From a paper:
Nuclear translocation of the p50/p65 heterodimer is essential for NF-κB signaling. Upon activation, p50/p65 is translocated into the nucleus by the adapter importin α3 and the receptor importin β. In the classical pathway, importin α binds to importin β through its N-terminal Importin-β binding (IBB) domain8,9 and to [name]-cargos through its C-terminal 10 stacked Armadillo motifs (Arms) that collectively form an Arm-core.
Similarly, the best diffraction data for importin α1 (~2.20 Å) were obtained from crystals bound to just the p50-[name], while a complex with both the p65/p50-NLSs or just the p65-[name] diffracted to 2.40 and 2.82 Å resolution, respectively. The two isoforms adopt a nearly identical conformation of the Arm core, and the p50-[name] P1–P5 residues (Arg361-Lys365) are not only superimposable in the two complexes (RMSD of 1.095) but also occupy equivalent positions. Meanwhile, importin α1 residues 75–497 are perfectly superimposable (RMSD 0.26–0.39 Å) in all complexes of importin α1 bound to either p65-, p50-, and both NLSs, underscoring the rigid structure of this isoform7 that can stretch [name] peptides at the major and minor binding sites by making extensive mainchain contacts.
Numbering used by the authors:
A (entry chain B): 436 to 442
B (entry chain E): 75 to 497
Write the structure that this text describes.
């Protein structure tokens, strides 16, 4: 569904 | 690492640079992989401030930091995405698509993909706010290769979310608008871009025949077949799903998949070491042997019947279930001489062995294919030779036992074979 952007 | 309290005191300074530093701090908290404190940020009331920072054209950094922070809140549960939509974020993110700074418009693309990715409602809400025009405008270059790689992959992924989900499917005019770009991305040479483009096509082909036709008419089946033969599993998986979706349609929509050469790849797919590939490939096969007799003939000519016999003999149970459906469809629509051919490929004994499975539905489909095969033998007069074959490989004990078990549709069809073919 979704993507968190990381460091 | 700042506390949420200090972020709050910083965001409430009415000092733009203090707010910028506090928004960085929030952004870094929300970008940590192990429990990001999304609910704490939401519960502190920070979302309306973040949304207001999206409109600060003068301070592009705080635009980027807020879009970043909001992106990760929208990446959470449906409630946390709701909190972002409830703060007015959709119109603000759509304005940011026009940002002269590439990293900021990219961040808006990403955030809108997270919102649309929540489900049908937010996806259609993103569309009603007019996101499709500025998104497509970002891909309006003569050659996609002049776009930055990560930039292009975020566009592709967000567009695929706009194609995603049913109940309801995306609006018809929205998909007509997206498809031309989507086919371009389907011919791009980046694997990540190809994979998400294939996923979008698989979503669009997951519905009634009218939706299938709309994709087939854009001419993507030859490209889907080529991606079917790729070495990258993340590409094959959505490509096979889209092909499998297309063969659920009409017989002539299925014919376009056969004409593109898809069957030549299936020896590989039906022996693939990845369970899901085998299942989806067998499921696709089941919907092709549900077609016309000349379409069953192409399955035979491509040498796929022994591969169906092998997947029936040894595979994960879900794959064996799809194989049984393939044979029942084959036996339902095939000529008697395709049926004869199926028996000479060794179908009987793997088919008898699956009669001891503890699943009531696979049993039902297998009896129904045994019936179909007998009726073919009945037009040749070989019902005696067949009943011997079924008895000789241990299949008659199975039917006798099935003749008396729970389900009603089985034993009414189980006794039918006993008192019509064994006496």
């Amino acid at each position: 569904r979704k993507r968190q952007k990381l460091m | 690492n700042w506390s949420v309290e200090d972020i709050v005191k910083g965001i409430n300074s009415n000092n733009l640079e203090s707010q910028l530093q506090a928004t960085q701090a929030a952004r870094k908290l929300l970008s940590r992989e192990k429990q990001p404190p999304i609910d704490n940020i939401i519960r502190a009331g920070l979302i309306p401030k973040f949304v207001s920072f999206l409109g600060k054209t003068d301070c592009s950094p705080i635009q980027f930091e807020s879009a970043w922070a909001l992106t990760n809140i929208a990446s959470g549960t449906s409630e946390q995405t709701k909190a972002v939509v409830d703060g007015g974020a959709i119109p603000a993110f759509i304005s940011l698509l026009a940002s002269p700074h590439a990293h900021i418009s990219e961040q808006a693309v990403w955030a809108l993909g997270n919102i649309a990715g929540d489900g049908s409602a937010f996806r259609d809400l993103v569309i009603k706010h007019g996101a499709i025009d500025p998104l497509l405008a970002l891909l309006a270059v003569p050659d996609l290769s002049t776009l930055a790689c990560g930039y292009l992959r975020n566009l592709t992924w967000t567009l695929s979310n706009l194609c995603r989900n049913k109940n309801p499917a995306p609006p018809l005019d929205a998909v007509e608008q997206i498809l031309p770009t989507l086919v371009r991305l389907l011919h791009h040479n980046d694997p990540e871009v190809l994979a998400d483009s294939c996923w979008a096509i698989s979503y669009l082909t997951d519905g009634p025949n009218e939706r299938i036709e709309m994709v087939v008419k854009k001419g993507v089946v030859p490209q889907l077949v080529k991606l079917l033969g790729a070495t990258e599993l993340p590409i094959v998986t959505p490509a096979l799903r889209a092909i499998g979706n297309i063969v659920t349609g009409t017989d002539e929509q299925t014919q376009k998949v056969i004409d593109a050469g898809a069957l030549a790849v299936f020896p590989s797919l039906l022996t693939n070491p990845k369970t899901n590939i085998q299942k989806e490939a067998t499921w696709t096969m089941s919907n092709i042997t549900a077609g016309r007799q000349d379409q069953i003939q192409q399955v035979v000519n491509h040498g796929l019947v022994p591969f169906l016999v092998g997947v029936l003999s040894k595979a994960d149970f879900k794959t064996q279930k799809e194989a049984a459906w393939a044979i029942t469809n084959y036996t339902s629509g095939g000529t008697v001489e395709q049926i004869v051919y199926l028996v000479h490929c060794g179908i009987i004994e793997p088919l008898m062995n699956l009669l001891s499975a503890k699943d009531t539905k696979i049993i039902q489909v297998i009896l129904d294919a045994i019936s179909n095969i007998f009726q073919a033998a009945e037009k040749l007069g070989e019902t005696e030779k067949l009943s011997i074959m079924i008895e000789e490989c241990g299949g008659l004990d199975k039917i006798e036992a099935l003749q008396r078990h729970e389900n009603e549709s089985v034993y009414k069809a189980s006794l039918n074979l006993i008192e019509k073919y064994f006496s």
